[PDB]
Amino acid sequence: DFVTLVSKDDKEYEISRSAAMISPTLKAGRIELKQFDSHILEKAVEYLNYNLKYSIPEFEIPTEMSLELLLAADYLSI
């Protein structure tokens, strides 16, 4: 009961279907998220799991990826 997720790099990531359901743009299956690096998606998945759990600690966001991560959250509507 998982959902696969691919990055710009060939690195893949699996997410609980109930966790990926938080993103209205992730109805899958399998999704290819070009234009986003591996460190970004790893943090997006980290937030999704973090969201389903407490939906409270603070979700740490590295400064060096705040802009790019904002764009990913927008596209994912999370």
Partner: protein, 402 residues
């Protein structure tokens, strides 16, 4: 007869401040790059995407505005400027000299000084889109158009009753022959739409937008026909929403007469025209080829039925459409959607389309590989059993109404 030594030193000082300004301007460039680089960096190609994210989160303000300063960006769009102060607009103009196109949506705080900073500090500015500049009075509009005389190629203004007929005249008098794109939306004081055919003479005019005139009879068939006789040849964007006074006459004597068969239209919208018939649009679509139509909306064209949509799809638009709005077309039947098989269609608004049921959603999902969103708000015959193959999402379900 001889300047004092004090005056001479002051001239030397003043001259060196001016030259030092440019040095300081460069030092400013580095400091703004530092902010962007510290946050992970952002190319100019993503600056508009960043602005969109901030806008949707009501997070665009004088503080975050600094992310967009001292760049070589040429086209900037701000979707919600409500929180940007008059000083914010002045600083943007000072620190973004390379701008040629600027869109300020929901710019409630833009005032006289802010508007003249934009016109006088952005020497390459040729396109300005403003939505909600309710502070600007008619006399300020005149001053702005004088300053932009011969430079303004694109002007769209919306949501202000202080843009008067006098202001429209000063726009046309000062910039008429230069305009290739014009937008007039929800301007309660505008009634002289009849002046547009006189002044919009540029042989490259391509974008006309008119929405919700205060007195609907002020946008009549005669005016739109005469206008089409001028711009129809190069028209790539035609938007006439809420112009309820228009009839098939505009379709027969205007669009069909003056739109070339090799039609360059990429965007077409005729929302809320309850007098336009299925027959006139079928007649028009069969004549022309719409191989470049990217966006099309017939929202609340209550009379339109199957043949209008079929003729549209079969005459080129099928392969180019990316979004299509059929909202409230109660006359459509299932046969219309049989032909709706588009390789590039991604968004489809079927709100209040009586005939839509699960079988239609099923068929559409299989005939449109890139379709991702279908609005079925009001389509009671769409149940939970509506098949949604991977990637397609339905909005407007009953869960959104309880």
């Amino acid at each position: 007869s001889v300047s004092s030594l004090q005056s001479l030193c002051i001239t030397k000082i003043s001259e060196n401040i001016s030259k030092w300004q440019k040095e300081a301007d460069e030092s400013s460039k580095l400091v703004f790059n530092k902010l962007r680089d510290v946050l992970g960096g952002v190319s100019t190609a993503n600056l508009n995407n960043l602005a969109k994210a901030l806008s949707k989160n009501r997070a665009l303000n004088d503080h975050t505005l600094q992310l967009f300063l001292k760049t070589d960006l040429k086209r900037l769009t701000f979707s919600d400027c409500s929180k940007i102060s008059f000083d914010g607009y002045k600083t943007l103009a000072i620190f973004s000299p390379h701008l040629t196109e600027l869109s300020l949506q929901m710019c409630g705080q833009l005032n006289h000084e802010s508007l003249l900073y934009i016109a006088e500090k952005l020497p390459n500015l040729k396109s300005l889109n403003l939505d909600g500049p309710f502070l600007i009075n008619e006399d300020t509009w005149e001053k702005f158009f004088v300053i932009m005389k011969g430079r303004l190629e694109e002007f769209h203004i919306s949501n202000t009753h202080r843009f008067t007929d006098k202001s429209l005249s000063n726009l046309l008098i000062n910039c008429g022959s230069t305009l290739v794109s014009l937008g007039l939306s929800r301007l309660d004081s505008i009634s002289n739409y009849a002046l547009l055919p006189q002044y919009l003479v540029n042989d490259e005019f391509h974008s006309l937008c008119i929405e919700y005139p205060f007195n609907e009879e002020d946008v009549n068939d005669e005016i739109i026909i005469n206008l089409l006789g001028q711009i129809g040849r190069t028209l790539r964007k035609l938007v006439l929403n809420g112009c309820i006074d228009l009839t098939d006459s505009m379709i027969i004597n205007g669009l069909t007469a003056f739109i070339p068969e090799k039609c360059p239209l990429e965007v077409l919208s005729l929302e809320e025209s309850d007098q336009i018939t299925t027959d006139s649009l079928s007649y028009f679509f069969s004549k022309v080829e719409l191989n470049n139509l990217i966006e099309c909306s017939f929202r609340r064209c209550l009379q339109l039925g199957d043949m209008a949509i079929i003729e549209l799809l079969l005459n080129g638009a099928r392969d180019s459409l990316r979004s299509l709005n059929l909202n409230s077309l109660k006359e459509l039947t299932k046969e219309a959607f049989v032909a709706l098989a588009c390789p590039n269609l991604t968004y489809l608004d079927l709100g209040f389309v009586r005939c839509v049921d699960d079988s239609v959603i099923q068929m559409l999902g299989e005939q449109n590989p890139n379709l991702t969103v279908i609005d079925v708000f009001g389509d009671n015959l769409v149940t939970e059993k509506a098949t949604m193959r991977p990637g397609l999402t339905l909005i407007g379900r009953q869960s959104d109404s309880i």
